[PDB]
Amino acid sequence: ALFDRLGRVVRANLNDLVSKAEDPEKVLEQAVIDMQEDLVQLRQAVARTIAEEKRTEQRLNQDTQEAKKWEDRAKLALTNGEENLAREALARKKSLTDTAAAYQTQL
Amino acid sequence: SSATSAFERMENKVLDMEATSQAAGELAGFGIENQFAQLEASSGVEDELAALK
Amino acid sequence: SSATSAFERMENKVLDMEATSQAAGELAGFGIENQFAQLEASSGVEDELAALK
Amino acid sequence: AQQRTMSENLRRNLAALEAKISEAKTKKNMLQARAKAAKANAELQQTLGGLGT
Amino acid sequence: AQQRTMSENLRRNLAALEAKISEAKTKKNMLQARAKAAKANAELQQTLGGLGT
C-alpha cells in the first residue's frame, strides 16, 4: 500500500494548503450563516409536519359529524316506516366511524 | 380528470398552506396572545376605575 | 337497410344510454331520495303546526 | 304519464347538482381568500423574522 | 333472472374493490406524512451532531 501512502501525502499537503487559506473571522461568520440558513429550512419542514397534524385532526372531526348526520338520518327513516334507507345509512355511518378511528390513531 | 377532483386537490393544498403559515408563526415565536391577555386585564381595571368615578 | 331498422337500432342505443346514466348515478352514490324523504317528513309536521295555529 | 314520471326524476337530479355546483362556487371564493391570507402571512413572518440573512 | 344474479355479485365485488381503494388512499396519505416526518428527523439529527468532514 505504498501508493496509498503517496496519496495520503498528496492529500495532507492540500489539506495544509486549504487550512492556511482559511481566514479566521471570515470562515467563522460563514459557519454561523450556514447554520442559520439550515435552521431556516429545518424550521420550515417542522412547520409542514406540525401542519399536517392539524389537517389530520380536521378530517377526523369532520368524519365524526358526517357519522352523526347519517345516524340521525337512520333514526328518522326508522321513525317513518322505511327499513331500507336506515340500513344503508347505518352502514355508511359505520364506514365513516372506522375511518374516524384510523384517523384518531394516526393523529 | 373530473372538475370536483381538481377542486378537492387544490382545496387540500390551500388548507395545508394555512396550516403551514400557522405552524411557521408558532415556530418563529408566537406573540398574538401574551399581549392580548395583558391588554385585557389592564383595560379591565381601567374600566372599573372609570365606572366607579 | 330499411328506415325502420335504422330507427330501431338508434332507439335501442338511446334507451341503453339512459339506463347507463341511471346505473352510473347509483354506482356514484345515489342521493335523490334520502333527502326527499326527509324534506317530506319535515314539511309534514310543519304543515300540521301551521294548520293547527 | 310516461313523460311526466321521467321529467320529474330529471328535475330532482338537476336540483341536487345545482346545490352541488353552488356549494363549490361559494367555497371557491372563500378558499381563494384563505389561500391569499396564508401566502401573505408566511411571507411577512419570514421577512419580519430575524432568522436567516 | 340470470342477469340480476350476475349483477348482485358484480356489485358486491365492486364494493370490495372500492373499500380496498379507500384504504389505499388513506394509507398513502399517512405514508406521505410519515415520510416527511422521517426526512425532517433525519435532517435534524444530521444538523445537530458534528458528524462528518
From Swiss-Prot, chains B, C:
Disruption phenotype: Essential, it cannot be completely disrupted. Cells with very low levels of protein have no ordered thylakoids, are barely green and are non-photosynthetic. The chain holds residues 162 to 214 of 267 of the full protein. It is found in: Cell inner membrane. Required for thylakoid formation. This is Membrane-associated protein Vipp1. Belongs to the PspA/Vipp/IM30 family.
